[PDB]
Amino acid sequence: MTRDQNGTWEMESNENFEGYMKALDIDFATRKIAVRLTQTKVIDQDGDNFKTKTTSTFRNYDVDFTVGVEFDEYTKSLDNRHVKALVTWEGDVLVCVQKGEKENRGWKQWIEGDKLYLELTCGDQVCRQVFKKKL
Numbered sequence: 242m243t244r245d246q247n248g249t250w251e252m253e254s255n256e257n258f259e260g261y262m263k264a265l266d267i268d269f270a271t272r273k274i275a276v277r278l279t280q281t282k283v284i285d286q287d288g289d290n291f292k293t294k295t296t297s298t299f300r301n302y303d304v305d306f307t308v309g310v311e312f313d314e315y316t317k318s319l320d321n322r323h324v325k326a327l328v329t330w331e332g333d334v335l336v337c338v339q340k341g342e343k344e345n346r347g348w349k350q351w352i353e354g355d356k357l358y359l360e361l362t363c364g365d366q367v368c369r370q371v372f373k374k375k376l
């Protein structure tokens with residue numbers, strides 16, 4: 242069922258979110274706040290149509306997309322940049338490339354049973370997050 246990412250996922254680990262944020266030029270005051278936050282991620286998946294919501298005490302980030310359809314992503318409340326984003330399946334891994342000002346920007350998201358993994362990349366920095374399927 243490795244492509245079914247539907248549900249609510251609760252963060253349990255968040256490695257080098259700081260390195261990823263610094264690569265995006267996030268201001269120090271925001272990084273100092275955001276590096277501690279536990280995140281929740283809600284995915285509404287209907288085949289290749291995705292509606293996702295990543296939430297916290299500090300800020301939320303929503304992004305909707307269709308696999309294989311390049312779209313104009315505006316990273317509101319993150320680094321507030323415009324990127325051309327494409328999400329595709331590479332095996333059972335959901336792979337997004339975000340081309341714009343920053344090089345080697347994207348993410349990879351996949352399921353392992355009751356765990357959701359998300360690797361965020363920007364240039365020289367990789368952030369590794371693990372979420373647990375909501376109890």
Ligand SMILES: CCCCCCCCCCCCCCCC(=O)OC(CO)CO
Binds near residue numbers: 293361
């Ligand atoms: C980082 C600057 C200040 C943060 C301030 C606090 C925000 C924490 C929650 C949102 C954090 C969201 C990070 C990117 C997630 C992403 O875009 O990938 C998703 C798209 O679908 C994969 O599910």
